[PDB]
Symmetry: C2
Subunit: 122 residues, 2 copies
């Protein structure tokens, strides 16, 4: 069996995600794992997705995270893991990605991990 499993999304994640989707009071949310729970790290107003990831790149408090970004036509969801992140941290974020995806609906799930702002130049 795996060392880490059964990590859970707290209700507040779904609450704020729905605030974003329905009430449009923010344009992005960053989720992290703390105390074996997925919680909200921060949220804010959408400029561009590139600008969001640039901010994340410069914020060393964030090693890995799940991110949603309201691009209006779609809400993108992705895992972020900076190149310098620890492989074992990446493994637990990877395995817990399914947990947050079960709790939030209506997102476009990106097919690649985002490591830096270069990766979102699509």
């Amino acid at each position: 069996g795996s060392m880490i499993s059964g990590i859970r999304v707290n209700d507040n994640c779904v609450t704020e995600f729905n605030n974003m989707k329905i009430r449009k009071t923010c344009g992005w949310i960053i989720f992290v794992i703390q105390n074996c729970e997925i919680i909200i790290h921060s949220k804010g107003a959408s400029t561009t997705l590139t600008e969001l990831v640039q901010s994340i790149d410069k914020n060393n408090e964030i090693q890995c995270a799940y991110v949603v970004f309201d691009a209006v036509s779609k809400i993108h969801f992705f895992m972020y893991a900076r190149e310098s992140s620890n492989s074992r941290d990446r493994m637990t974020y990877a395995s817990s990605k399914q947990a947050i995806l079960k709790k939030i609906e209506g997102v476009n799930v990106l097919t690649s991990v985002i490591e830096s702002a270069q990766d979102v130049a699509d």
Copy 2:
């Protein structure tokens, strides 16, 4: 806050530990973390502590673990982490050591992490 926390010792760990202490049906137990719970990896008959750690050294299924060894005069408890183990795995085993120590009583807690059989030549 920390990524991982609140890892719990399942009842069976205490049950078997007491079997060892009271009924002397084994002389050592190896505990690991699986699915965010501390469980029993294996148990067996005591030869020497050096021989136990030599076996652990050769068993690649074990990266880190908590170990108890009945030396008759004392029951030693220690964390094992092979030199090649991952630093983040060591961190979560380290932080969860207090959890198993609260559940088991009457052990001599070693002051150093054991990395190989050389470390127990005391």
